């Protein structure tokens, strides 16, 4: 991690809970991450979005 390589949380888009922490490079990957993840709240995979740590 660095000023450019940041930590971020992934929020389930259906129930709004942050379910995963991970990291990315914001120079290489400026758009907010969107990833399908398993939401344990929703009990199903859900598109999760990068939301600020």
């Amino acid at each position: 991690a660095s000023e450019v390589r940041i930590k971020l949380l992934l929020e389930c888009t259906e129930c709004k809970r942050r379910n995963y922490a991970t990291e990315k490079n914001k120079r290489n990957t400026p758009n907010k991450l969107e990833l399908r993840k398993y939401c344990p709240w929703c009990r199903k995979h859900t598109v999760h979005r990068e939301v600020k740590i």
Partner: protein, 64 residues
């Protein structure tokens, strides 16, 4: 004068039915973003303190 219960021990540790000493796994207070899920999960359990260390803690808890 009577012994006093050590309050840091009472707050961190429990003596089980058979007198083992139990405490929360250390290591997920923070810096967790790069820890695997196997890691965070496993650190979420209680463990049983090593005998000589538990034996010491047990003596600080004279009235449990």
């Amino acid at each position: 004068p009577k012994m006093k219960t050590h309050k840091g021990a009472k707050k961190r540790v429990k003596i089980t039915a058979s007198g083992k000493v139990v405490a929360m796994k250390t290591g997920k207070r923070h810096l967790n973003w790069q820890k695997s899920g196997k890691e965070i999960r496993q650190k979420g359990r209680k463990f049983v303190l090593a005998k000589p260390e538990a034996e010491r803690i047990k003596l600080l808890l004279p009235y449990e």
